[PDB]
A paper describes a structure:
Curiously, the suppressor of copper sensitivity C proteins (ScsCs), which are part of the bacterial copper-resistance response, share structural and functional similarities with DSB oxidase and isomerase proteins, including the presence of a catalytic thioredoxin domain. Here, the structure and function of Caulobacter crescentus ScsC (CcScsC) have been characterized. It is shown that CcScsC binds copper in the copper(I) form with subpicomolar affinity and that its isomerase activity is comparable to that of Escherichia coli DsbC, the prototypical dimeric bacterial isomerase. Using mass photometry and small-angle X-ray scattering (SAXS) the protein is demonstrated to be trimeric in solution, like PmScsC, and not dimeric like EcDsbC.
For our structural studies, we used a variant of CcScsC in which the second residue Cys2 is mutated to Ser (CcScsC C2S). One possible explanation for this is that CcScsC wt may form a disulfide bond between the N-terminal cysteines at the high concentration required for crystallization (above 100 mg ml−1, well above physiological levels) and this may interfere with the crystallization process. Replacing Cys2 with Ser in the C2S variant does not affect the disulfide isomerase activity or trimerization of the protein. The crystal structure of CcScsC, solved to a resolution of 2.63 Å, confirms that the protein is trimeric and that the trimer is formed through the interaction of the N-terminal regions of three protomers. The α-helix joins the globular domain of the protein at Tyr52. The globular domain of the CcScsC C2S protomer is a typical thioredoxin fold with two catalytic cysteines (positions 81 and 84; pink sticks in Fig. 6) in close proximity to a cis-Pro motif (Thr191–cis-Pro192). In the unit cell, six protomers are organized by crystallographic symmetry into two trimers. Each trimer is formed from the interaction of the N-terminal α-helical regions of three protomers. While we captured a single conformation of CcScsC C2S in the crystal structure, the comparison between the scattering profiles predicted from the crystal structure and the experimental SAXS data provides strong evidence that the protein trimer can sample multiple conformational states in solution.
Author numbering:
A (entry chain A), B (entry chain A), C (entry chain A): 2 to 223
The structure:
């Protein structure tokens, strides 16, 4: 060709169709949304793999069943209702599958009370009562800072030493770095589970069970 | 046919038109919005008909001119400015058209003050001073709970008995069930008028007048 | 023609293309956004020209280097961080280009503290210390009403007379009319610069420098 040649009749027919069947635009918008979601999924799993050393293998982290082969990281806040309602199931899942390694990240999204519960937990970490304290703190309906201390006291934790480690600048740096890790993983809130490349946003227990099964099978393929 | 045959030239012409006349997408989006609005209108009128027994014929409700053939239900809050500015016109409309039956639903959307005005009105319901108390409460600019009591006192209402009925668990259940009815009718706020199948959202006096005329004519067709 | 003749095959091909290349809709949406932005730009510059007498030539306004040919109007709030960070550069720009006439509009968007700083500045206007007071008020990190008075006192301003003029009903009308002018210019916040027909929304120093150059060149074309 050597000439741009307009075709008004073709355009009129295009407009007529679109106006008479505008649902085509909804369908195309849905295609684009599925495209955008797949892009986000790829970015999330690439980030999970980039920071896996920090997500799954941080010495400062509280780890339930450190023998586990499959590492499930949980970002949580001790006063988030979704975290509290998912906690019993998470602990039952570690209870029934010993090959699970549960990394507990303290992702404080609320105020001083939640920060206080996290610091107590991290201070008592090395006294070997993390499973019980985690379950008990999550069990209190309206967990205060005073309540958190009373719960940790009622479990025989060395309170003087747990409080000393909790407020230390090391625990402060630990929590700050965890907040940074959540930001790098583009997390939106709590709970947020990370198993394999998968990210489970929220208290979606069934999805987390499925992801653990997938990772067990995939890692078993060797 | 036996073969899917691509046509890149047709698609290029489609893209060219859309990019050169993207207003077609606005026009199609407008068509879809009109479709969605008509769907919502149908759902609203079907719901109004489903719960008509509760909307128009609840013995606990305050009813102005119970003789009326045409039932106009109003969901209102005594401290909503739109309700207060529409009230004089609503009462003039019942004043000039005796065949109107005005059901007064107390749809408390604000705090304790509004709840207090509603309870006083429902407590004094059976003392035969509802029109006057409704108009006077709506007339006070900054209606407090103290103010509402002073208004009801200045109208000769038996205050000891009106206060006794107001706080009763019956009035509490009445208000709770009304809040539920508004939720089932997908109401967004106050005022909200319901005449025939029509729902008038807000202080749209002209639309309400028109809807009463339509229902009078339709019910007169027998 | 004498007949509307449907063409289902043409419409199916349109739908197929759109679903297989829905990015065409994003591209068309971008075209429409560029169209809407150009419309807004035209409306803004037409409004700037309509109210130029008020923007650039209001006797009550504080004006730095009133000799300047090029009038740059700034809407600002003494406690807006963007205004405080842009202020040093604005003053350096007047410092290096004498032909600039800087009109200072007090666009109070915050509470009493900002209103107090503006009233002090407008009260001291006629004592010939506006450049210094403007720079000093903008220099205080957490400017209070008490702080603003201490800054104006530390600059030798006649405090009794500056305070008398500040609270006067004239200064109140001045600020109210400025708030009205910003509303007529559809301003969204502070800072907001106006030079020639151009409106620079925010602390976009480079754009403001460019706009001053353009206006200098255009007005020099005679």
């Amino acid at each position: 060709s050597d000439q741009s040649k307009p075709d008004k009749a073709f355009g009129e027919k295009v407009r007529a169709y679109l106006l008479e069947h505008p649902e085509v635009l909804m369908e195309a918008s849905q295609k684009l949304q599925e495209k955008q979601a797949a892009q986000q999924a790829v970015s999330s799993q690439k980030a999970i793999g980039e920071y896996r050393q920090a997500i799954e293998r941080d010495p400062r982290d509280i780890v339930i069943n450190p023998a586990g082969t499959i590492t499930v990281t949980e970002f949580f806040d001790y006063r988030c209702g979704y975290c509290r309602q998912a906690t019993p199931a998470v602990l039952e899942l570690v209870q029934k599958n010993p090959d699970i390694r549960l990394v507990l990240k303290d992702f404080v999204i609320f105020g001083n009370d939640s920060e206080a519960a996290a610091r107590i937990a991290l201070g008592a970490k090395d006294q070997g009562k993390s499973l019980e304290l985690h379950k008990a703190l999550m069990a209190e309906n309206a967990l205060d800072a005073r309540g958190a201390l009373r719960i940790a006291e009622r479990l025989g934790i060395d309170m003087d030493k747990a409080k000393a480690v909790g407020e230390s600048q090391a625990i402060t740096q630990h929590l700050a770095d965890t907040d940074a890790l959540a930001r790098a993983l583009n997390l939106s809130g709590t709970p947020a589970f990370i198993v394999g490349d998968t990210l489970v946003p929220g208290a979606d227990i069934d999805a987390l069970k499925l992801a653990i099964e997938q990772t067990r099978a995939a890692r078993a393929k060797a």
